[model samples]
Target: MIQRTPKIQVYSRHPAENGKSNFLNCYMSGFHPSDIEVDLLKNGERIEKVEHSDLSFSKDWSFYLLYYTEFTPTEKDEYACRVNHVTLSQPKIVKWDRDM
Candidate 1:
């Protein structure tokens, strides 16, 4: 037998509440994760990193509807919603993942 890693993915269309850029209001009331990381990747490069509080997800930590704010796709784009070390780059494979 051989050791293998499972393939899992994050949602790419996590949108903002008010604008075309979708805000990611993550919900995990009963299913609490330790923390999360949002990776914004565009055109083969990871340009931004969002590390925020998981307090809201752990419990009902926000009264506001919009908790996590996400971005819109400018032509083609990619992102990862991470809980712990898990990474989800895109709905489909972007250019960068091929390079990796």
Candidate 2:
């Protein structure tokens, strides 16, 4: 049987609050299976206590799915988010930059 691969797309939005209490949001949304992996990294280090804050179906006719998560940044560390799925040969990373 032929397997279907997901059309993966990823990006991050603005951090909420803009102060010490900030949520680094990352989004990975497309059509595929529900077993995708997303990692929040701090200067190339993986952060474990992460969760998918929201999930919903896209309104487009493609019926794609939306997956998003948030992470709280500390100090002035550079942050990034990585995603892995069956459709990708390697994990994709999106870095967050700020002027501090």
Candidate 3:
């Protein structure tokens, strides 16, 4: 049997195929419970438009989820992803600074 909390990671990516806005994402994996919540934010404000996905079950039945958002920036700003789950004492927040 498995007994542990999820592993969380944050990421920053280049512009999309259209080369419009930069991308930021959060990845959570190896979680026991499937009912998890995620929030994306930009410059300390909550983002309403975000792209999200989840992948569950592999040869070993491991699972992962992805949440991403995009923004066009003229200056440096903070971007963050907050995750909530049963295993966490408090919400896990991962953040990064946007580029020019």
Candidate 4:
């Protein structure tokens, strides 16, 4: 079985504003061999009650998965996404850009 590395993006459903409620998402796609893990983090710790979208595939046969949770962005906290897959030598971490 060939292993394909996944691409990751961490972003908010809406333009982030401190003290406002928004959805935090970790999107992973373009990977092979469906077994994968994704987590949303706050200040380097895992956030609870994260919901996942059903695994789907693209025309190229790579898979896609999304993990998301409700969060309120604040100046004192950091947000990130962490992924683990067979193709990765180490866990991949992507940080959310609140300014975006």
Model 4, span 1-100: residue lDDT tens: 5678988888888545744567888888888888898878899998877865657887656898888877878888999998999888899999998755
When sorted by TM-score, best at the front, the candidate numbers are: 4, 3, 2, 1
Better of 2 and 3 by TM-score: 3
Q: Rank the candidates by lDDT, best first.
A: 4, 3, 2, 1
In lDDT terms, which candidate is top? 4
Residue lDDT tens for model 1, 23-83? 4233223222233333334554544544332442323422211124454554455543332
Query: What lDDT score goes with residue 93 in model 3?
Result: 80
Q: lDDT scores for all predictions?
A: 0.34, 0.59, 0.71, 0.83
lDDT of 3 by residue, 1-100 (tens): 5544668777767766766556677778887666788888777777888865756755354567877766664456677778888788898887754431
**TM-scores for every candidate against the unseen true structure:** 0.32, 0.60, 0.75, 0.84
Q: Where does candidate 4 have its weakest 10-residue lDDT segment? A: 13-22
User: Model 4 scores what on Cα lDDT?
Assistant: 0.83
**79-98 in candidate 2: lDDT tens per residue?**
87787767678887877654
TM-score of 4: 0.84
Error of 1 at 30 (Å): 4.0
Itemize residue pairs with steric clashes in candidate 4.
Answer: none
- Model 2 is weakest, by summed lDDT over 10 consecutive residues, at 59-68
- Model 2: residue 95 alpha-carbon error in angstroms: 0.9
As a whole number from 0 to 100, the lDDT of residue 83 in candidate 4 is 92
